[PDB]
Design an enzyme around this catalytic site. Structure first.
Site, PDB file in Angstrom:
ATOM      1  NE  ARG A 142      -3.619  -0.131   0.042  1.00 50.62           N
ATOM      2  CZ  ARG A 142      -4.279   0.072  -1.088  1.00 50.62           C
ATOM      3  NH1 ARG A 142      -4.315  -0.846  -2.041  1.00 50.62           N
ATOM      4  NH2 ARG A 142      -4.900   1.234  -1.276  1.00 50.62           N
TER       5      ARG A 142
ATOM      6  CG  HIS B 153      -3.348  -2.723  -9.986  1.00 52.43           C
ATOM      7  ND1 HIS B 153      -3.597  -2.145  -8.761  1.00 52.43           N
ATOM      8  CD2 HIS B 153      -2.174  -2.211 -10.418  1.00 52.43           C
ATOM      9  CE1 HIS B 153      -2.619  -1.303  -8.473  1.00 52.43           C
ATOM     10  NE2 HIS B 153      -1.743  -1.325  -9.461  1.00 52.43           N
TER      11      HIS B 153
ATOM     12  CB  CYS C  55       1.744  -1.696 -12.002  1.00 52.63           C
ATOM     13  SG  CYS C  55       1.480  -0.815 -13.557  1.00 52.63           S
TER      14      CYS C  55
ATOM     15  CG  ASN D 194     -10.471  -4.147  -7.595  1.00 53.29           C
ATOM     16  OD1 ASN D 194      -9.727  -5.099  -7.821  1.00 53.29           O
ATOM     17  ND2 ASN D 194     -10.034  -2.990  -7.074  1.00 53.29           N
TER      18      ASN D 194
HETATM   19 MG   LIG Z   1      -7.803  -5.944  -8.404  1.00 52.45          MG
HETATM   20 ZN   LIG Z   2       0.750  -2.680 -14.714  1.00 52.76          ZN
END
Ligand SMILES: [Mg+2]
Ligand SMILES: [Zn+2]
Ligand SMILES: [Mg+2]
Ligand SMILES: [Zn+2]
Ligand SMILES: [Zn+2]
Ligand SMILES: [Zn+2]
Lengths: 162, 162
Positions: free
Chosen positions: B60, B97, B104, B118
């Site tokens: 985090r 993500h 990233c 998500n």
């Molecule tokens: Mg995710």
């Molecule tokens: Zn990435």
DNA sequence: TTGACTCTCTTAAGAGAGTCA
DNA sequence: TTGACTCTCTTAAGAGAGTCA
């Protein structure tokens, strides 16, 4: 420790009691635009729940039996799997609702798998929509679909490539 | 901060800093037996991380800027979406993500959606295997597959039907 | 031995805020 | 002002254990 026979007796008493829970007919998506029917055996919303059952959380219950003066207690959906391994690939096994109905205690609607496998069934396209689960889903997951994404990938400048 | 101009300035500063993160090439399953390549802009493993960035947990981070002589701070992946609604259907919007790579910070690998949307991408078959996400996945989810279920649905007696 | 309550915990996708230098 | 740490929280799929009569 409880013998195999004692565990079998626990499973049998659990089945007897759950078999008297109200049986509710639900029409459900199977994937591929097809509809099917599931028959859930639903624990009551409030006490009394049935012999041996008590509520430990809003949608959590436990099953309790006293054997030779010792109190034994299990998560209410774990009882069908007491003769199974309790871990796999280093992960704890969890009771997993194929019907996605927490109150249901129908053992034909439960499987025993990692929490990740369990969660992932929420998004499965279903047994007629492309399910690849080795232990097949009974229905399309309730969260399957295009989603409701608010904003997609984007940049204001030119610093990034995908 | 409050003004749209101040928010645009925050996004621009964030993009400039993240654009200098190491670019790491990851080859990924797309579904359908196909493979693709993603370019992730990865925050360093240890301090220093970049101007404005600090680690608040194992994976985090937070971005902070001083505006109007006050410190304004955000989750490190939330900054691209500061001008977007912060909820949808009464559910909190989260940075999600598409590359499934926490370190990233490439905004071309992020979207802004409910925590349920998500999570569900972890099991998606991918852009060449049947992804139906309206904001399309960049890769097959890392948890896609048959699973490792230990025990399937079963009963000992004759109390239940599917 | 039993029922009906009480409490906190786990996981892995995500968060906010305080303490110092 | 900026950096580098510290802490606990949220969610929705799941858990274990105590008290009292
Ligand atoms: Mg995710
Ligand atoms: Zn990435
Ligand atoms: Mg489940
Ligand atoms: Zn059911
Ligand atoms: Zn499935
Ligand atoms: Zn997808």
């Amino acid at each position: 420790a409880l013998t195999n026979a004692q565990i079998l007796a626990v499973i049998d008493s659990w089945e007897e009691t759950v078999g008297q829970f109200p049986v509710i007919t639900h029409h459900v998506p199977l994937g591929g635009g097809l509809q099917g029917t599931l028959h859930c055996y639903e624990i009551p919303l409030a006490a009394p729940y049935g012999v041996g059952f008590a509520k430990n959380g809003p949608t959590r219950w436990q099953y309790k039996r006293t054997i030779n003066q010792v109190v034994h207690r299990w998560g209410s959906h774990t009882v069908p799997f007491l003769l199974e391994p309790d871990n796999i690939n280093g992960k704890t096994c969890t009771a997993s609702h194929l019907c996605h109905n927490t109150r249901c205690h129908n053992p034909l609607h439960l499987c025993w798998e990692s929490l990740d496998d369990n969660k992932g069934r929420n998004w499965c396209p279903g047994p007629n929509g492309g399910c690849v689960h080795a232990v097949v889903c009974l229905r399309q997951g309730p969260l399957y679909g295009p989603g409701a994404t608010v904003a997609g990938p984007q940049q204001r400048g030119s610093h990034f490539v995908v």
